[PDB]
Amino acid sequence: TKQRADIVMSEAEIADFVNSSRTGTLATIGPDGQPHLTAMWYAVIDGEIWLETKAKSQKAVNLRRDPRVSFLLEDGDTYDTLRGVSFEGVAEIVEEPEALHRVGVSVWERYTGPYTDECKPMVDQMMNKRVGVRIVARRTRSWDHRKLGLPHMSVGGSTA
C-alpha cells in the first residue's frame, strides 16, 4: 500500500544500510496471532539478512508454525534525517552446518572483528544448538528523509 517516490532508497542504498546497521526489530507471529517482537543483531550473506537463534526459542517455534516475518531497520535522530527499511516476507529455518558457519562468521565479523581459523572454536560455540534464519523479503518499503532537502535540525526536547 504505497512507497513515496521522493524518499525511497535505491537498491544499492538499502544494501549499504543493511550492511551498515547493527540492530533491527524482528516480528514473528505468536500462536494466537500476537506479534512477537525482539531486537536482533544479524548476519548478512549474499545480500540477505540471516539470524541465529536457539533451535527451541520462541521465534524458531513461531516460525516453523508460520514462516511469515517482518524486519525493520531504522536510524536518524531528527525528522530530516529519519531513514529506514521495512521488510515483510518469509523466513527459512536452516540447520545445514556450512550455512550456520557462514552465519557465525558474518556475525563475528560484523560485531567482533575479523575472522581467522583460530576463532573457529568460539564461532562453533556461538552456533552450537542454534539454527540459521534466512529472511526473504517479498515487500520492501524504504525511506531517507535527507532526500527532502529540509533544513538540518539539531536534536531537541526533553529526550535530548
Q: Domain span at residue 74?
A: 8-112+124-154
- Element (DSSP H or E) covering residue 36: strand 35-40
Instruction: Name the experimental technique.
Output: X-ray
Return the closest-CA partner of residue 141 out of 92, 88, 85, 91.
Answer: 85
Residue 119 counted as domain residue: no
CA end-to-end span of the chain, whole Å? 33
Are 95 and 55 in contact by the 8 Å Cβ rule? The answer is yes
94 near 60, Cβ under 8 Å? no
Give the CATH number of the domain where residue 49 resides: 2.30.110.10
Q: What are phi and psi of 79, to 5 degrees?
A: -55, -40
Q: In this structure, is residue 42 part of a structural domain?
A: yes
Q: Tell whether 134 is covered by a domain.
A: yes
At what resolution in Å was this solved?
2.0
Q: Is residue 2 part of a domain?
A: no
Residue 44 within a domain: yes
CA distance 36 to 58: 9
Work out how many domains the chain is built from and give that number. 1
Q: Which three cell numbers stand for residue 21?
A: 546497521
Does residue 159 belong to any structural domain of this protein? Answer: no
**In the 8-state DSSP scheme, what is residue 77?**
S
Say if CB 135 and CB 70 are below 8 A apart.
Answer: no
